[PDB]
């Protein structure tokens, strides 16, 4: 007879058998329960880059609420973005963050999450009018996602008061 | 002495003891962590059925974002819905989907979830004005939920640009 | 040789080794999966207290959707709130709830969650105009959170139709 062996996330050390727990995901308070890691509200500025229908950049003030392995993004723009077409792509690369939090892992999506486009709420003012769209993002790599949204009209224009609301599973 | 026996989700095969993991819920990367299953953004059309305060139907364009065991619904209507009263019930039965994704399990709520009404965001235009409500749905069975919302006024009318935003735990 | 010992959330009773599961977080259906606890939609009234930029109180009609260890709050006000400044703090203490649900644990945030400010969506009408803000709350203790939001203008005024939308991890 072979004895008993323990496969991850089960482990054994000095006769004690344990469940190894990601504290951002789970903990025990006797029974197996939700995360024990402290939540963070991160505040930083993110320079987004127009990558299609714009060669412009725009500063976003970002509040990243990290709770368990959910990071929720609340972004607001200062400035006008120059658009050239009826659709624009705005790229969000982790290198274009100033500040940059130490828990950078809270801004990288899981491999599971990265596999699909995800919903992004977009609003902005163009020609004094408030536009609002159900847009979509997709990660191109683990550090970079691009959102795609309508500009409100055609040709060259300036969109202002850009808000972005979305979230990722990390 | 009886020995040791392992209760689900613990299991033993050839001396190796494991935690069986639903990959839509959890995985191990050494420690027990969040889901490893790939996210999906599903796109299909859903014919909703007025079931009270309407005998009409309306085509919805649905984006179902499946991430872990969360499915988030973003629906937008093409067409007018005929209403007859100040409140309407709109039924969403899985059989009235065209396309219909192969991972249909992503559109069935958990028994836990099904036990309560859940929040649904509803908006639409009636008489040129944009209405918006915090509405509620409830599953009648595991395949069928009905949302209940105000129509914006009284008697016969046509509501347009119907949006529905909600999510289910599957 | 010492034998094998089982650390929480693993446990052993009469030779049977188990994973103890918080049913609000997890269950087994063979593999380890999401919560099995029934969801609740709670409905109660909550008297909020102006604690800075107001010495007033305001009745909120609250719908608390409890699903797993997520509680989502949908609040709507009846009445005017008297404000005195350009920013207001509104306190939500569990003692000021009437009704008060028996599953009060669904309205206490986790120690993890409590550690950070969290996003709160606020809207209201002032001077006939509809204001809307991305606001923030923070728990001062496990029973009491305070939201902080702009009033829409300055000096004494009355804000009406106050809505509050937020959620907590419990």
mmCIF file of N, CA, C and O in Angstrom, chain A residues 83 85-88 118-126 129-137 147-154 159-166, chain B residues 74 76 163 165:
data_model
loop_
_atom_site.group_PDB
_atom_site.id
_atom_site.type_symbol
_atom_site.label_atom_id
_atom_site.label_comp_id
_atom_site.label_asym_id
_atom_site.label_seq_id
_atom_site.Cartn_x
_atom_site.Cartn_y
_atom_site.Cartn_z
ATOM 1 N N UNK A 83 -11.352 63.643 -31.808
ATOM 2 C CA UNK A 83 -11.791 62.532 -32.684
ATOM 3 C C UNK A 83 -11.901 62.943 -34.174
ATOM 4 O O UNK A 83 -12.052 64.124 -34.490
ATOM 5 N N UNK A 85 -13.508 60.531 -36.599
ATOM 6 C CA UNK A 85 -14.429 59.568 -37.201
ATOM 7 C C UNK A 85 -15.643 59.349 -36.286
ATOM 8 O O UNK A 85 -15.715 59.926 -35.188
ATOM 9 N N UNK A 86 -16.594 58.532 -36.747
ATOM 10 C CA UNK A 86 -17.792 58.203 -35.963
ATOM 11 C C UNK A 86 -17.599 57.113 -34.879
ATOM 12 O O UNK A 86 -18.467 56.914 -34.028
ATOM 13 N N UNK A 87 -16.460 56.426 -34.908
ATOM 14 C CA UNK A 87 -16.123 55.474 -33.860
ATOM 15 C C UNK A 87 -14.699 55.764 -33.409
ATOM 16 O O UNK A 87 -13.846 56.143 -34.215
ATOM 17 N N UNK A 88 -14.437 55.583 -32.117
ATOM 18 C CA UNK A 88 -13.072 55.738 -31.589
ATOM 19 C C UNK A 88 -12.633 54.534 -30.727
ATOM 20 O O UNK A 88 -13.450 53.909 -30.069
ATOM 21 N N UNK A 118 -15.687 42.711 -22.634
ATOM 22 C CA UNK A 118 -16.475 42.973 -21.455
ATOM 23 C C UNK A 118 -17.215 44.325 -21.605
ATOM 24 O O UNK A 118 -16.735 45.214 -22.307
ATOM 25 N N UNK A 119 -18.375 44.479 -20.937
ATOM 26 C CA UNK A 119 -19.096 45.768 -21.023
ATOM 27 C C UNK A 119 -18.363 46.962 -20.398
ATOM 28 O O UNK A 119 -17.749 46.828 -19.342
ATOM 29 N N UNK A 120 -18.397 48.110 -21.089
ATOM 30 C CA UNK A 120 -17.853 49.403 -20.587
ATOM 31 C C UNK A 120 -18.934 50.487 -20.764
ATOM 32 O O UNK A 120 -19.444 50.686 -21.863
ATOM 33 N N UNK A 121 -19.317 51.158 -19.690
ATOM 34 C CA UNK A 121 -20.194 52.325 -19.807
ATOM 35 C C UNK A 121 -19.435 53.611 -20.144
ATOM 36 O O UNK A 121 -18.562 54.058 -19.383
ATOM 37 N N UNK A 122 -19.810 54.213 -21.267
ATOM 38 C CA UNK A 122 -19.175 55.441 -21.752
ATOM 39 C C UNK A 122 -20.194 56.567 -21.896
ATOM 40 O O UNK A 122 -21.304 56.369 -22.399
ATOM 41 N N UNK A 123 -19.821 57.737 -21.397
ATOM 42 C CA UNK A 123 -20.552 58.966 -21.655
ATOM 43 C C UNK A 123 -19.583 60.133 -21.850
ATOM 44 O O UNK A 123 -18.417 60.075 -21.404
ATOM 45 N N UNK A 124 -20.084 61.178 -22.531
ATOM 46 C CA UNK A 124 -19.334 62.375 -22.893
ATOM 47 C C UNK A 124 -20.272 63.447 -23.491
ATOM 48 O O UNK A 124 -21.415 63.158 -23.892
ATOM 49 N N UNK A 125 -19.789 64.691 -23.532
ATOM 50 C CA UNK A 125 -20.528 65.760 -24.178
ATOM 51 C C UNK A 125 -19.872 66.083 -25.512
ATOM 52 O O UNK A 125 -18.651 66.148 -25.618
ATOM 53 N N UNK A 126 -20.693 66.225 -26.544
ATOM 54 C CA UNK A 126 -20.226 66.688 -27.843
ATOM 55 C C UNK A 126 -21.306 67.636 -28.325
ATOM 56 O O UNK A 126 -22.512 67.318 -28.221
ATOM 57 N N UNK A 129 -24.276 68.566 -26.155
ATOM 58 C CA UNK A 129 -25.151 67.447 -25.771
ATOM 59 C C UNK A 129 -24.443 66.259 -25.089
ATOM 60 O O UNK A 129 -23.357 65.837 -25.498
ATOM 61 N N UNK A 130 -25.094 65.727 -24.060
ATOM 62 C CA UNK A 130 -24.623 64.576 -23.301
ATOM 63 C C UNK A 130 -24.963 63.247 -23.975
ATOM 64 O O UNK A 130 -26.125 62.818 -23.961
ATOM 65 N N UNK A 131 -23.942 62.611 -24.564
ATOM 66 C CA UNK A 131 -24.039 61.232 -25.098
ATOM 67 C C UNK A 131 -23.753 60.163 -24.038
ATOM 68 O O UNK A 131 -23.021 60.428 -23.088
ATOM 69 N N UNK A 132 -24.343 58.971 -24.201
ATOM 70 C CA UNK A 132 -24.139 57.824 -23.290
ATOM 71 C C UNK A 132 -24.240 56.499 -24.050
ATOM 72 O O UNK A 132 -25.242 56.256 -24.732
ATOM 73 N N UNK A 133 -23.205 55.653 -23.962
ATOM 74 C CA UNK A 133 -23.220 54.366 -24.671
ATOM 75 C C UNK A 133 -22.855 53.156 -23.808
ATOM 76 O O UNK A 133 -22.078 53.244 -22.853
ATOM 77 N N UNK A 134 -23.457 52.025 -24.158
ATOM 78 C CA UNK A 134 -23.055 50.732 -23.671
ATOM 79 C C UNK A 134 -21.951 50.302 -24.608
ATOM 80 O O UNK A 134 -22.226 49.847 -25.707
ATOM 81 N N UNK A 135 -20.703 50.499 -24.207
ATOM 82 C CA UNK A 135 -19.571 50.151 -25.062
ATOM 83 C C UNK A 135 -18.927 48.785 -24.646
ATOM 84 O O UNK A 135 -19.460 48.057 -23.798
ATOM 85 N N UNK A 136 -17.776 48.459 -25.230
ATOM 86 C CA UNK A 136 -17.100 47.189 -24.947
ATOM 87 C C UNK A 136 -15.602 47.385 -24.995
ATOM 88 O O UNK A 136 -15.085 48.153 -25.807
ATOM 89 N N UNK A 137 -14.911 46.717 -24.083
ATOM 90 C CA UNK A 137 -13.460 46.621 -24.122
ATOM 91 C C UNK A 137 -13.011 45.189 -24.391
ATOM 92 O O UNK A 137 -13.811 44.256 -24.321
ATOM 93 N N UNK A 147 -10.930 50.208 -25.388
ATOM 94 C CA UNK A 147 -12.395 50.348 -25.518
ATOM 95 C C UNK A 147 -12.799 50.935 -26.892
ATOM 96 O O UNK A 147 -12.033 51.661 -27.513
ATOM 97 N N UNK A 148 -13.985 50.571 -27.369
ATOM 98 C CA UNK A 148 -14.466 50.972 -28.687
ATOM 99 C C UNK A 148 -15.819 51.601 -28.447
ATOM 100 O O UNK A 148 -16.673 50.962 -27.858
ATOM 101 N N UNK A 149 -15.993 52.864 -28.853
ATOM 102 C CA UNK A 149 -17.273 53.566 -28.688
ATOM 103 C C UNK A 149 -17.640 54.611 -29.799
ATOM 104 O O UNK A 149 -16.756 55.203 -30.441
ATOM 105 N N UNK A 150 -18.950 54.848 -30.008
ATOM 106 C CA UNK A 150 -19.377 55.890 -30.965
ATOM 107 C C UNK A 150 -19.051 57.339 -30.520
ATOM 108 O O UNK A 150 -19.143 57.676 -29.326
ATOM 109 N N UNK A 151 -18.680 58.186 -31.479
ATOM 110 C CA UNK A 151 -18.271 59.565 -31.165
ATOM 111 C C UNK A 151 -19.395 60.607 -31.107
ATOM 112 O O UNK A 151 -19.176 61.695 -30.585
ATOM 113 N N UNK A 152 -20.589 60.273 -31.608
ATOM 114 C CA UNK A 152 -21.768 61.142 -31.474
ATOM 115 C C UNK A 152 -22.169 61.875 -32.755
ATOM 116 O O UNK A 152 -23.208 62.606 -32.795
ATOM 117 N N UNK A 153 -21.362 61.653 -33.797
ATOM 118 C CA UNK A 153 -21.430 62.388 -35.045
ATOM 119 C C UNK A 153 -20.257 61.987 -35.922
ATOM 120 O O UNK A 153 -19.678 60.927 -35.722
ATOM 121 N N UNK A 154 -19.890 62.852 -36.875
ATOM 122 C CA UNK A 154 -18.849 62.540 -37.863
ATOM 123 C C UNK A 154 -17.757 63.596 -38.038
ATOM 124 O O UNK A 154 -17.845 64.683 -37.480
ATOM 125 N N UNK A 159 -14.601 65.753 -28.043
ATOM 126 C CA UNK A 159 -15.527 65.221 -27.043
ATOM 127 C C UNK A 159 -14.976 65.561 -25.669
ATOM 128 O O UNK A 159 -13.761 65.592 -25.464
ATOM 129 N N UNK A 160 -15.867 65.852 -24.738
ATOM 130 C CA UNK A 160 -15.453 66.356 -23.452
ATOM 131 C C UNK A 160 -16.182 65.622 -22.352
ATOM 132 O O UNK A 160 -17.183 64.924 -22.593
ATOM 133 N N UNK A 161 -15.714 65.833 -21.134
ATOM 134 C CA UNK A 161 -16.328 65.227 -19.974
ATOM 135 C C UNK A 161 -16.488 63.703 -20.145
ATOM 136 O O UNK A 161 -17.530 63.153 -19.793
ATOM 137 N N UNK A 162 -15.476 63.051 -20.736
ATOM 138 C CA UNK A 162 -15.507 61.598 -20.948
ATOM 139 C C UNK A 162 -15.495 60.854 -19.587
ATOM 140 O O UNK A 162 -14.644 61.099 -18.722
ATOM 141 N N UNK A 163 -16.522 60.044 -19.367
ATOM 142 C CA UNK A 163 -16.535 59.121 -18.258
ATOM 143 C C UNK A 163 -16.432 57.677 -18.791
ATOM 144 O O UNK A 163 -16.927 57.335 -19.889
ATOM 145 N N UNK A 164 -15.751 56.846 -18.007
ATOM 146 C CA UNK A 164 -15.633 55.416 -18.290
ATOM 147 C C UNK A 164 -15.896 54.660 -16.985
ATOM 148 O O UNK A 164 -15.338 54.989 -15.918
ATOM 149 N N UNK A 165 -16.823 53.714 -17.072
ATOM 150 C CA UNK A 165 -17.179 52.847 -15.972
ATOM 151 C C UNK A 165 -17.142 51.412 -16.452
ATOM 152 O O UNK A 165 -17.820 51.053 -17.420
ATOM 153 N N UNK A 166 -16.301 50.614 -15.789
ATOM 154 C CA UNK A 166 -16.184 49.188 -16.069
ATOM 155 C C UNK A 166 -15.555 48.444 -14.873
ATOM 156 O O UNK A 166 -15.217 49.049 -13.842
ATOM 157 N N UNK B 74 -27.155 42.886 -21.048
ATOM 158 C CA UNK B 74 -27.298 44.201 -21.673
ATOM 159 C C UNK B 74 -28.228 44.053 -22.882
ATOM 160 O O UNK B 74 -27.800 43.542 -23.911
ATOM 161 N N UNK B 76 -31.122 45.717 -25.698
ATOM 162 C CA UNK B 76 -31.639 46.907 -26.358
ATOM 163 C C UNK B 76 -32.700 46.505 -27.359
ATOM 164 O O UNK B 76 -32.531 45.510 -28.065
ATOM 165 N N UNK B 163 -34.430 49.556 -23.143
ATOM 166 C CA UNK B 163 -33.217 48.930 -22.674
ATOM 167 C C UNK B 163 -33.509 48.148 -21.377
ATOM 168 O O UNK B 163 -34.372 48.526 -20.551
ATOM 169 N N UNK B 165 -31.112 46.147 -18.367
ATOM 170 C CA UNK B 165 -29.829 45.840 -17.778
ATOM 171 C C UNK B 165 -30.057 45.112 -16.470
ATOM 172 O O UNK B 165 -30.745 45.616 -15.578
#
